[PDB]
Design a protein around this ligand. Structure first.
Ligand SMILES: Cc1nc(NS(=O)(=O)c2cc(Br)cc(Cl)c2O)cn1C1CCCC1
Length: 300
């Protein structure tokens, strides 16, 4: 019916806005990125600080885990992405080619490719082993806000401030489909059939991408400025989860679109949220008046 998320830990350490939080696929870790140029690794269940990973020359907008939880990829204002060995903290590769800030990144399920989006309006596809750029897609006419592979890796979805969401064939780089307020976030649904898209008019929408039809709309939060992540919560009740510019985490019922919970505690915009892969745990993180990450746990 409704979850009962409750604050369990607050994680301090970043010295500027947090930009992204992500749980490792094996559930053990939370990774956070920040405008302070750092990645921090934390225990997913107790919030225990594990390590700082450093090397970018400017702030980081996004981080993403490989499928085996051993690698991380980061997107930076220094125009590069970096591939990191999480166990050693070492930079394995620096991915060079974007001509402006890199805003978003993800591995494919195989974790042999990375996709990135940039203020330079392109999407790039990179080889993980060599660190070389394989394709540059002239994807958008304004900064690219999000990029994500689907569940078999054959598709990429991208979104942009130009108002478009596009689906790309990974193998060829060619556009399969296009779907205008700025689109600030997109990702494929767990079952691969839907795309969840945020627009800077305080709206989330669930699209059937095959049919090109909007199936659900979620509102009541505040999102007119920032690229705020949204999530599917797959461990307990079927929820949509998002931060908000009124400093709250919002949780909706996937099917009824009703708000089922709002989490209070942050003291700045909640720019990022993540849902744990096996436990009913949310991580949230806020902009520079707050700079903390919060871990929330529910019984359902
Ligand atoms: C009931 C249902 N399941 C899906 N699949 S899903 O979006 O991928 C998905 C979301 C979540 Br939260 C958790 C899990 Cl486990 C999932 O599989 C869609 N819908 C309804 C049908 C019409 C659109 C909403």
């Amino acid at each position: 019916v409704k979850p009962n998320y409750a604050l369990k830990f607050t994680l301090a350490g970043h010295t500027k806005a947090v930009s992204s939080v992500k749980f490792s696929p094996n559930g053990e870790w939370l990774a956070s990125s920040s405008a302070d140029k750092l990645i921090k690794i934390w225990g997913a269940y107790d919030g225990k600080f594990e390590k700082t990973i450093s090397g970018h020359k400017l702030g980081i907008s996004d981080v993403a885990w490989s499928s085996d939880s051993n690698l991380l990829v980061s997107a930076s204002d220094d125009k590069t992405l970096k591939i990191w060995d999480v166990s050693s903290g070492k930079c394995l590769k620096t991915l060079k080619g974007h001509s402006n800030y890199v805003f978003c990144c993800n591995f494919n399920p195989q974790s042999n490719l990375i996709v990135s989006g940039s203020f330079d309006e392109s999407v790039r596809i990179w080889d993980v082993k060599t660190g070389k750029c394989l394709k540059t897609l002239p994807a958008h006419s304004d900064p690219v806000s999000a990029v994500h592979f689907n569940r078999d890796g054959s598709l990429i979805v991208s979104s942009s401030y130009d108002g478009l969401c596009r689906i790309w064939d990974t193998a060829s780089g060619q556009c399969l489909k296009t779907l205008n307020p700025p689109v600030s976030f997109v990702k494929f649904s767990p079952n691969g059939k839907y795309i969840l898209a945020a627009t800077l008019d305080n709206t989330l929408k669930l699209w059937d991408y095959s049919k090109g039809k909007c199936l659900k709309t979620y509102t009541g939060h505040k999102n007119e400025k920032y690229c705020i992540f949204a999530n599917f919560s797959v461990t307990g009740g079927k929820w949509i989860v998002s931060g908000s510019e009124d400093n709250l985490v919002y949780i909706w019922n996937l099917q009824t679109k009703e708000i089922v919970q709002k989490l209070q505690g942050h003291t700045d915009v909640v720019i990022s949220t993540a849902c744990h892969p096996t436990e009913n745990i949310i991580a949230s993180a806020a902009l520079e008046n707050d700079k903390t990450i919060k871990l929330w746990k529910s019984d359902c």
